[PDB]
Amino acid sequence: DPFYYDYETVRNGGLIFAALAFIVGLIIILSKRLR
């Protein structure tokens, strides 16, 4: 079906990136040794 683009793959990739970036930002703001 050359009319169906897998949107779930991109959705999962973006959600994975969002979660990773949020965790990184959380670690940066709540850093224990990042002085």
Binding site: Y5, R11, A18, A21, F22, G25
Partner: protein, 995 residues
């Protein structure tokens, strides 16, 4: 405000009539030892803290709700109300309607909730930090409890407590004078007259105000020292009843907030004007009645930087905390911005520039200079302790002294113990105790009959002692003071025991020795004595103190004594930074011109090459009056000369001189010097520690009060408090003051940059008639949800290396929001951001089937909900919702491109003068925001259901990288621009883009 002489002369009932016994049995207090700490705690817990009742504080659900329904928030609340009303209308119409308007209204509600909570959190943090300052260094009170005198918190003082105050002390509560020794209080805040009235235990008047045995709250003792008993505490105090309801502060305006308010009103007006214009245009373009308000709200939000006030509050509070952590306690929030504009610093030599830890180092007697103060190895001195003249020198150095050693000090050396008295007196005591013997016994044999403390009128000390010897005429007058003045008060000098008349040869040698010791950075003091004739003054003669009867002249000079007072460690570097930052520093001290000149030259006030008129004359062996006055860039002005000077001469000296040092200048004359500096158009910061400095501290733009040795009068009469009395702290404070301006301008530039790329799509959609590239939901999402943290992150940026390498800023010409700032944010950066957004939008539409050229004019049928056969560039037919999905996808792509360009803009906004490679990304909050905004955007674009809730659909990967060239372009452009400004200062780029 008729609260003076009318609301005071009526509420009056005291117990000044009570005698010592009646007072003791009434309050139940040990008149000689004070109440016990246990009893003090009991009275404290019974009556309450010694403080005034504070005003009511609004609860937590008051500020939160006021922010929720704030001014700007009202627009979104009304938008949600209109959306819910439209959904209600749509529910009554045609069956099976859609939830588009319902979801839009709920989205607006969520936006308002998030904005309100974030603003409430920021305001709460600012309020908490601001309140933390009132308890930084609270005012202390010296009370007497269980026999010992201790300094406790002012709020811990209760009625009946035995309190002791001195010159420069602030009265903690209404008191009854029990014992006093020449005490004079100032009732300017009580009766109106600034003239000081004496306070004495003797009952002289039945009226509470007129009596001499009652100390009132809020007033301060100008001269003397006394002990009293608290008669009323808290709100019951005399001045307390008046200061609680009639001394409230008025509406103090902060210029940093005023300039922002002005720009805020301008931007609000232009934004609302464009909003209503687009509103009427949208209605004319056959659009929904609700879509018009949607576009209006979006335009207003994207063009109004409604977070400017919050950013300003964050910058002010953060830098205020920075100053507090660097020994700069800002009494008021306005001074926080005046520090960066500082241009002249009138500091003192003893106390602030130096550590005031004097040490007797050199002496001069028997026409010779002698070193002393052995390194406590019991070596004594470098000369003989049996010198005849040295005996008279030690005698007058210890007998005329006024300082005494405290208890529990006979177990540690003399060069490391504490004293009670003048700093110079402390050095003299530690000297005689190290190389002569016991001062306690020396001061006992020569019993002191009468003593005259150091007075500005006499300019010398004085003391009469009875000698228990047999070869003396029972009288020994001893006095010290200014070497030049002490020398004019003598007729003879003691040389190895023999007294010989003071001829001109001896005076020449004394002058040479004076200049020699003065050039070394030591304060010299002259000492002399006299053995009055016995036939004229018998053993039992009564020397009157008030009525001088004994001879004051024709005495006998013994010798000179000089002490070492090293400057602070950071002082040379501080003055170096001051000169490197175009800040004129003036030293105001009361020492001799030679000593002050040497100290100023050593600390860096007077750099090499700069010579005064006297130095030039000495080098060319010509009279000083003949030398050219303009050839001297630096000078040392004498106090006596300053007294006979006019405003014109003052302006001439302060105008054509770059390094001025006013020596022998009394502290009261400081006000005139500050006035002269201000008259030259300069923002001055003046240091004060005594009570007479009050007029000068109040007149100066920034009064810096000494926090350690400074009295309460100076602290309450100043604008800033130096936590360590270190001069370098003032320079660090000025640096932080400039940093506030730098960060405020950077944040302003970053918040306004996003306005252009957010409003350009509406303008192009109306001019080019292309499908909407950026929607209202997207603009609201960006401004209130993603760039809310980065805009605040700029307040935490540190200072560049050129912060103290530029001229100071003048409030009359250098303002925050200038034309160049708009030209840079709206004309250069905003244009690149908008171009990147349009590029990504064109990429999406071109990839889905509509060529960029074909999109012109299609908005007419694109927005049509019934023409569901729009032919694309390839000839395909799209429906209404199908094409709208692509339009919303383009909106999300524009949102992503916006965040991408915001990354580069935020990075380049970290610095406006240096390169991003020099400052570095040491800003943790900034990087946190970079990560948070990207994460939030990704989540909003990929979270399931956003396509129908936020109308945001998943964004394909090959689109996320469409705006990267624009971000890198902004990065390289700003870097080369800053490189040009650095390599060519004052150039066209600097004079045109340096905001």
């Amino acid at each position: 405000e008729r609260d003076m002489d009318e609301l005071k002369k009526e509420v009056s009932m005291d117990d000044h009539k009570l005698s010592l016994d009646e007072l003791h049995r009434k309050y139940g207090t040990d008149l000689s030892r004070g109440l016990t700490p246990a009893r003090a705690a009991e009275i404290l817990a019974r009556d309450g803290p010694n403080a005034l009742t504070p005003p009511p504080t609004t609860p937590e659900w008051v500020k939160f709700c006021r922010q929720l329904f704030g001014g700007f928030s009202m627009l979104l609340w009304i938008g949600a109300i209109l959306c819910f009303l439209a959904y209600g209308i749509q529910a009554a119409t045609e069956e099976e309607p859609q939830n588009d308007n319902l979801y839009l209204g709920v989205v607006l509600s969520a936006v308002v909730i998030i904005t309100g909570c974030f603003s409430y959190y920021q305001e709460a943090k600012s309020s908490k930090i601001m309140e933390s300052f009132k308890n930084m260094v609270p005012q202390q009170a010296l009370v007497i409890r269980n026999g010992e005198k201790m300094s406790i918190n002012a709020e811990e003082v209760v009625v009946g407590d035995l309190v002791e105050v001195k010159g420069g002390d602030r009265i903690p509560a209404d008191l009854r004078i029990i014992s006093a020794n020449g005490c004079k209080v100032d009732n300017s805040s009580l009766t109106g007259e600034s003239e000081p009235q004496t306070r004495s235990p003797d009952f002289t008047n039945e009226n509470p105000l007129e009596t001499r045995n009652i100390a009132f709250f809020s007033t301060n003792c100008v001269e003397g020292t006394a002990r009293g008993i608290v008669v009323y505490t808290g709100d019951r105090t005399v001045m307390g009843r008046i200061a609680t309801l009639a001394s409230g502060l008025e509406g103090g305006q902060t210029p940093i907030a005023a300039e922002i308010e002005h720009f805020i009103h301008i931007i609000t007006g232009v934004a609302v004007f464009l909003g209503v214009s687009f509103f009427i245009l949208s209605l004319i373009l056959e659009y929904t009645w609700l879509e018009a308000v949607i576009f209006l709200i979006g335009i207003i939000v994207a063009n109004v930087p409604e977070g400017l006030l919050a950013t300003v509050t964050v910058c002010l509070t953060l830098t205020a905390k920075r100053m507090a952590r660097k020994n700069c306690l800002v009494k008021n929030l306005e001074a926080v911005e005046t520090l960066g504009s500082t241009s002249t610093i009138c500091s003192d030599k003893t106390g602030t520039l130096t550590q005031n830890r004097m040490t007797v180092a050199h002496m001069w007697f028997d026409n010779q200079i002698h070193e002393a103060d052995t390194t406590e190895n019991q070596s004594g001195v470098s000369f003989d302790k049996t010198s005849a003249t040295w005996l008279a020198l030690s005698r007058i150095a210890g007998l005329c002294n006024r300082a005494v050693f405290q208890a529990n000090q006979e177990n540690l050396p003399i060069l490391k113990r504490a004293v009670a008295g003048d700093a110079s007196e402390s050095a003299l005591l530690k000297c005689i105790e190290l190389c002569c013997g016991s001062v306690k016994e020396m001061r006992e044999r020569y019993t002191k009959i009468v003593e005259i403390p150091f007075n500005s009128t006499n300019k010398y000390q004085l003391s009469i002692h009875k000698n228990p010897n047999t070869a003396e005429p029972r009288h020994l007058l001893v006095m010290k003071g200014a070497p030049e003045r002490i020398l004019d008060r003598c007729s003879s000098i003691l040389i190895h025991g023999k007294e010989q008349p003071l001829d001109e040869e001896l005076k020449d040698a004394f002058q040479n020795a004076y200049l020699e010791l003065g050039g070394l950075g030591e304060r010299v003091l002259g000492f002399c004595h006299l053995f009055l004739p016995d036939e004229q003054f018998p053993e039992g003669f009564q020397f009157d103190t008030d009525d001088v009867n004994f001879p004051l002249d024709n005495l006998c000079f013994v010798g000179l004594i000089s002490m070492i007072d090293p400057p602070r460690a950071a002082v040379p570097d501080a003055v170096g930074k001051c000169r490197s930052a175009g800040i004129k520093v003036i030293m105001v001290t009361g020492d001799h011109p030679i000593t002050a000149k040497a100290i100023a030259k050593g600390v860096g006030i007077i750099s090499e090459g700069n010579e005064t008129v006297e130095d030039i004359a000495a080098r060319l062996n010509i009279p000083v009056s003949q030398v050219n006055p303009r050839d001297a860039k630096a000078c040392v002005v004498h106090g006596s000369d300053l007294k006979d000077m006019t405003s014109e001469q003052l302006d001439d000296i302060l105008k054509y001189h770059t390094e001025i040092v006013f020596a022998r200048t009394s502290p009261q004359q400081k006000l005139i010097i500050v006035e002269g500096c201000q008259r030259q158009g300069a923002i001055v910061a003046v240091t004060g520690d005594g009570v007479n400095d009050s007029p000068a501290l109040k007149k100066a733009d920034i009064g810096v009060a000494m926090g350690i040795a400074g009295s309460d009068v100076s602290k309450q009469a100043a604008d800033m408090i130096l936590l360590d009395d270190n001069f370098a702290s003032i320079v660090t404070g000025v640096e932080e003051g400039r940093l506030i301006f730098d960060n405020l301008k950077k944040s302003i530039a970053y918040t306004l940059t996003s306005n252009i790329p957010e409003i350009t799509p509406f303008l192009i959609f109306i001019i080019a008639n292309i499908p909407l590239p950026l929607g209202t939901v997207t603009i609201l999402c960006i401004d209130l949800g993603t760039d809310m943290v980065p805009a605040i992150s700029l307040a935490y940026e540190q200072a560049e290396s050129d912060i103290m390498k530029r001229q100071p800023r003048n409030p009359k010409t250098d303002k925050l929001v200038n034309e160049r700032l708009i030209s840079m944010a709206y004309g250069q950066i905003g244009m690149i951001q908008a171009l990147g957004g349009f590029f990504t939008y064109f990429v999406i539409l071109a990839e889905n089937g509509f060529l960029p050229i074909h999109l012109l004019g299609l908005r007419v049928n694109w927005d049509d909900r019934w023409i569901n056969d729009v032919e694309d560039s390839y000839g395909q037919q799209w429906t209404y919702e199908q094409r709208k999905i692509v339009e919303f996808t383009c909106h999300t792509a524009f949102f992503v491109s916006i965040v991408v360009v915001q990354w580069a803009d935020l990075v380049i906004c970290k610095t406006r003068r240096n390169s991003v490679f020099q400052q570095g990304m040491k800003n943790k909050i900034l990087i946190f925001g970079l990560f948070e905004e990207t994460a939030l955007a990704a989540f909003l674009s990929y979270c399931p259901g956003m396509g129908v809730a936020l109308r945001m659909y998943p964004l394909k990967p090959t689109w996320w990288f469409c705006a990267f060239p624009y971000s890198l372009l902004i990065f390289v452009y700003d870097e080369v621009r800053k490189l040009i400004i650095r390599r060519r200062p004052g150039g066209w780029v600097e004079k045109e883009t340096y905001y």
